[PDB]
Design a protein around this ligand. Structure first.
Ligand SMILES: Cc1cc2nc3c(=O)[nH]c(=O)nc-3n(C[C@H](O)[C@H](O)[C@H](O)COP(=O)(O)O)c2cc1C
Ligand SMILES: C=C(C)c1ccc(C)c(O)c1
Ligand SMILES: [Cl-]
Ligand SMILES: [Cl-]
Ligand SMILES: [Mg+2]
Ligand SMILES: [Mg+2]
Ligand code: NA
Ligand code: NA
Ligand code: NA
Ligand code: NA
Length: 399
């Protein structure tokens, strides 16, 4: 069905429908598919779904010139811990990714691989089964009681990374980025948001380290920036973006309750701008808005009103993608895109609307999403959401 009480607005008369170049890609509009974990990869081997993933991405690539960021993809076994999320370290994975990238490109759209390392958000028992560590910045602060207890029961207590282990992750990010480009991706996004490993280093709640990787703003940012630099060197700044969620609380990050949080993220933005001014400007910075501090919560819940991401624009002077409860708020998007370097990521409603871009241009009703199938091993709720035309044929204008 369509979302019941939504009053759509046509956004075709806004900068959402003006072209923009991101990295090497000439986008034809500024509605971006942000990374969306869907848990259809198959075990063993974290293989992108051999039956459905091509079709899923093909559907969502249908508007020419769309930028798609993939679901988070693990850079190595040690970076993982969800059996049904994909990786980008093996030949068998890349065979499937190549098909996905080719399909997106045949629709004249673009694809950026999000590179994911879980840290304390991983399942410690899956890691133990596979002989892998359960990693984070620290060893004395935990995501939650259940994770701590699972790790202990698995004889895999949370481990504070050594400097050598950090270097090994950086090597894996580099190789994963290389693999992505070689298989045909247009670029990569470094996931430093939503409480995953890099964010666990950025945040003073999760990072209690006293070495060069914690204990100050500069030190907490060090791992993220080392990954940025390593990828810029390996595949070029024009093929690298970075995702941040300054106000996020998902995965037990601090959010605005931490009075130093804006400074921490302002420092990162400043370091990116310094690199840009020195000739190595990232393709984009992707920000999760305080509009959504926790994406498990229905739109309108978990909104933090005590902060804005606008500070980033005073610092970083390149493209900015913003995501968080924008599909139901065309009035907010209409104002944000007046800034000429702002793109809008639409997450949950791109799950349920493969033709979302047409619907945004033309002010059409939106398909309601089905949260129950966000992570199910099924084509249902993955590749069977209708286009607007198909929905009319199903009678959804009268449901
Ligand atoms: C099912 C689901 C999966 C997600 N997976 C990812 C992910 O892999 N990487 C990531 O950075 N964010 C992920 N997110 C966060 C989204 O990219 C997005 O920031 C968030 O849902 C807010 O935007 P929205 O209100 O348009 O959905 C996910 C969100 C949902 C609901
Ligand atoms: C909001 C959710 C459900 C989510 C899932 C996976 C990742 C990598 C993420 O960043 C966020
Ligand atoms: Cl509804
Ligand atoms: Cl799992
Ligand atoms: Mg110990
Ligand atoms: Mg159901
Ligand atoms: Na309208
Ligand atoms: Na099938
Ligand atoms: Na401003
Ligand atoms: Na249905």
């Amino acid at each position: 069905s369509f979302v019941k009480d939504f009053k759509p607005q046509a956004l075709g008369d806004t900068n959402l429908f003006k072209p923009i170049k991101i990295g090497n890609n000439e986008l034809l509009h500024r509605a971006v598919i942000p990374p969306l974990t869907r848990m259809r990869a198959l075990h063993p081997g974290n293989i992108p779904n051999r039956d459905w993933a091509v079709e899923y991405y093909t559907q969502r690539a249908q508007r020419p010139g769309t930028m798609i960021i993939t679901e988070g993809a693990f850079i190595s076994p040690q970076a993982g811990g969800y059996d049904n999320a994909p990786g980008v370290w093996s030949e068998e994975q890349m065979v499937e990714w190549t098909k996905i990238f080719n399909a997106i490109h045949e629709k004249k759209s673009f694809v950026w691989v999000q590179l994911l390392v879980l840290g304390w958000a991983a399942f410690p028992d899956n890691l133990a089964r596979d002989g892998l560590r359960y990693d984070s910045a620290s060893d004395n602060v935990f995501m939650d009681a259940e994770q701590e207890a699972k790790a202990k029961k698995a004889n895999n207590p949370q481990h504070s990374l050594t400097k050598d282990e950090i270097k090994q992750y950086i090597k894996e990010y580099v190789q994963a980025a290389k693999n992505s480009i070689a298989a045909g991706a247009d670029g990569v996004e470094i996931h430093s948001a939503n409480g995953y490993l890099l964010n666990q280093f950025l945040d003073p709640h999760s990072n209690t380290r006293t070495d060069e990787y914690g204990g100050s703003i500069e030190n907490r940012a060090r791992f993220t920036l080392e990954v940025v630099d390593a990828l810029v060197e390996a595949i070029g700044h024009e093929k690298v973006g970075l995702r941040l969620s300054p106000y996020g609380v998902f995965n037990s990050m601090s959010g605005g309750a931490e009075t130093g949080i804006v400074a921490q993220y302002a420092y990162v933005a400043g370091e990116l701008e310094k690199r840009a001014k020195a000739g190595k400007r990232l393709a984009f910075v992707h920000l999760v808005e305080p509009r959504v501090t926790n994406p498990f919560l229905t739109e309108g819940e978990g909104e933090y009103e005590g902060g804005s991401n606008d500070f980033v624009y005073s610092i970083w002077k390149g493209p900015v993608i913003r995501a968080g409860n924008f599909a139901l708020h065309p009035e907010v998007v209409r104002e944000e895109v007046k800034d000429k370097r702002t793109l809008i990521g639409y997450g949950r409603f791109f799950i349920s609307n493969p033709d979302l871009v047409d619907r945004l241009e033309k002010g059409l009703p939106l398909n309601k999403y089905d949260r129950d199938t966000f992570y199910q091993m099924s084509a249902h709720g993955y590749i069977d959401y209708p286009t607007y035309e198909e929905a009319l044929k199903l009678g959804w204008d009268k449901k």
